Amino acid sequence: MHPALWVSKTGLDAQQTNIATISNNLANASTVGYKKSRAVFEDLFYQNINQPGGQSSQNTELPSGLMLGAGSKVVATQKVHTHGNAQTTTNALDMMVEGDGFFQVTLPDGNIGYTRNGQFTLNGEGTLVTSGSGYPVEPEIVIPEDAISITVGTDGEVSVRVRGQQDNQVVGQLTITDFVNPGGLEPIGQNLYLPTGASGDPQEGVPGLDGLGEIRQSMLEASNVNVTEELVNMIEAQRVYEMNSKVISSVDKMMSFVNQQL
């Protein structure tokens, strides 16, 4: 009914999405290998009442035209893929990618899901699986019941030590996948990513050559969320949200006054 009513609706919508993004970051303040997200704001189209640069008289043009905006919106949720701090643990089956790279696990549908989480465990058959839903890790790493200790090298070589045998028994070789644009991956939950069109082709190789990161045994990657940043962004978003509520309230009072008078 009124242009300022629709413009502030877009402002309220953007701030609700911004707060929801912050609420998701603070919820995942202890999740292993979680990458924080930031909402990206952009203004909407401008209505063209007076054209800037239109020739009003010869040798004279409008220095600035009457262009009314349509509000603002949140256009994207950017996953900030900066490295998180390392947690030192006594577990031997939890790993970490020091640098670029994603662990690859086999989803039930058949595809491969890429994860930054390193919390792994064993299934009944001894296959190295995720500590959550239990997805097998690509390539499969089966630890025989003849082993007394598991050591995973920097280059991803999984080796176990056999009792009564003075020699490491190599039982696997982990390969990690890097993406040119990891922020373009589609988060599907459960600390898993799926490749997308803008993510780029998956490039797989040995973990430590050709720009890939290193596998760190007995170490976990913390989330990169900054609780100080999220709370300050929470306060700012709450005020901007209340800014557009006053504009709607003023427009609401304006229309009520006109109804009574006009």
Binding site: V232, I235, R239, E242, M243, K246
Partner: protein, 47 residues
């Protein structure tokens, strides 16, 4: 080059502790300024 020795850290617990206290103090002052600004905005939003 000397054998039989190692180099430990080149940090001083005294100076690190003093800088920790000073940095906490500066952080608290900046947060106080932020709170004052937020209170001003809230007061403006109560006309």
């Amino acid at each position: 080059i000397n054998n039989g020795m190692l180099e430990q850290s080149n940090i001083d617990m005294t100076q690190e502790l003093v800088d920790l206290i000073s940095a906490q103090r500066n952080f608290q002052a900046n947060s106080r300024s932020l709170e004052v600004h937020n209170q001003l905005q809230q007061n403006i939003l109560q006309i």
